[PDB]
């Protein structure tokens, strides 16, 4: 498939509808996904792993923070995933706490120092 | 070639076939341990000791152990020589460094001795003692259910992963029960007259269960009843039919004594003769329903009402 047809499958997955029904939200999804296609930060899985561990430690779930360390190695063990940074960066962002400041902590490199 | 080629594919033919058993295993010293063994041997300078070996696969060892537990003979592993099963010397897997396989197969061969001697004992009865011939029926009746369990294991071989270390722990409560038989039968094989050879055998069981006073006691009790059946039959027959009908003078009063029926024996003789003096002028089927409604000492003390009330009627 292509990403343009594949975005419409996502709009039919989240909103339970057919592609002939939902077309105003897909119109918005093309606006935000298009013109923001290229990756803006330098890719490294190490910083994202050390942030998912920090997040799982912060919720007093210290047992899952080192189970993630055994789950992240199997991704490298199998080896059919090309961009492991992007999917982890996405899965960290959609994370909810079952139950502040970030300019102080470690952030990704801006890619602006290089002549892109 | 065309049909025999289908054979060479769709047949497992390696150790038992007369051919060096070549094996495409996987690699990676979990299964490349034989090579890893040999090269450090040659660095440690044996010097070389490179003996021919058959290189069996893994699952076929489990199939042979199931056949050894069955009691069959003429197997490629555990070749017996003098009534004593013994592991072969060219058996090696890709792992287990050729020596540990000898140890585990030595333990399973020690169990194969216990099953093979009992199969030889049953063969020497099949091919009118009424007691040994009644004892091997209880032994055989144990053997069929034991064989059912192992033959069930052979089904899940052919149709889940399975190894040596899983099948031995699965057969733990059976290899426990067989070791009791190796000691119980050892007194029933070590002996010439037909009355002492049956009296000693029947008395050993009554002693050996009182040693064990749960699953072993159920096996010993279910083995006891089907061996004490002939004596109970002849005692009841002497009581109600008024005559002692013995074969080969099997019974102890030859017209040196089992202490099983000793606390009541006076009340048996004192009936048999008194009933024989009357005519000139289902007892096992009562002991077995007693088990339906503190084992073999107080429990045996409830059998004697059945032999004592009948006694009282005869003498009165």
């Amino acid at each position: 498939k292509s990403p343009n047809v594949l975005l419409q499958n996502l709009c039919c997955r989240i909103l339970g509808r057919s592609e002939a029904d939902v077309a105003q939200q897909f119109q918005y999804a093309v606006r935000v996904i298009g013109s923001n296609f290229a990756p803006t930060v330098e890719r490294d899985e190490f910083l994202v792993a050390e942030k998912i561990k920090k997040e799982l430690i912060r919720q007093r779930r210290e047992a899952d923070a080192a189970l993630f360390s055994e789950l992240h190695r199997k991704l490298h063990s199998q080896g059919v995933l090309k961009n492991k940074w992007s999917i982890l960066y996405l899965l960290l962002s959609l994370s909810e706490d079952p139950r502040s400041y970030a300019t102080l902590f470690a952030q990704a490199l801006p890619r602006d120092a290089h002549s892109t | 070639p065309d049909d025999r080629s289908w054979l060479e594919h769709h047949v497992v033919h390696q150790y038992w076939t007369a051919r060096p058993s070549q094996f495409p295993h996987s690699l990676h010293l979990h299964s490349n341990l034989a090579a890893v063994w040999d090269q450090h041997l040659y660095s440690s300078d044996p010097l070389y000791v490179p003996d021919d070996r058959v290189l069996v696969t893994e699952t076929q060892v489990i199939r042979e152990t199931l056949w050894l537990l069955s009691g069959v003979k003429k197997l490629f592993i555990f070749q017996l020589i003098d009534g004593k099963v013994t592991v072969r010397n060219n058996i090696i897997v890709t792992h287990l460094t050729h020596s540990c396989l000898r140890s585990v197969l030595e333990q399973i061969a020690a169990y194969g001795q216990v099953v093979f001697r009992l199969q030889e004992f049953i063969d020497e009865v099949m091919g009118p003692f009424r007691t040994y011939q009644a004892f091997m029926w209880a032994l055989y009746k144990y053997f069929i259910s034991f064989k059912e369990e192992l033959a069930e294991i052979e089904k899940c071989i052919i149709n889940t992963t399975i190894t040596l270390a899983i099948v031995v722990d699965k057969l733990a409560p059976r290899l426990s029960q067989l070791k009791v038989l190796h000691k119980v039968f050892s007194t029933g094989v070590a002996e010439t007259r037909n009355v002492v050879r049956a009296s000693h055998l029947l008395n050993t069981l009554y002693k050996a269960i009182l040693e064990y006073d749960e699953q072993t006691v159920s096996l010993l009790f279910s083995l006891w009843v089907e061996t004490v059946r002939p004596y109970l039959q002849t005692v009841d027959e002497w009581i109600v039919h008024g005559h002692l009908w013995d074969g080969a003078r099997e019974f102890i009063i030859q017209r040196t004594m089992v202490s099983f029926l000793k606390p009541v024996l006076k009340q048996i003789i004192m009936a048999g003769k008194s009933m024989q003096l009357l005519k000139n002028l289902e007892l096992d089927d009562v002991h077995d329903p007693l088990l339906a409604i503190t084992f073999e000492l107080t429990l045996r003390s409830c059998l004697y009402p059945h032999i004592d009330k009948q006694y009282l009627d005869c003498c009165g």
Partner: protein
Amino acid sequence: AAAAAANLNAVRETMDVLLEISRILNTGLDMETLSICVRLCEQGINPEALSSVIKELRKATEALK
């Protein structure tokens, strides 16, 4: 043949362990929408944009329900 079936096993394995990482992070995704998201992330797409897409569609599904 064989190399077309070994890849099928090697992709079932990763689509299971990514679901495990998804459930310890408590993301609201399931097995079907995650297969759309990993496919999108294979060709090269900003996760900061696609995550905003999902966080808008899941916020607009409640105003209609």
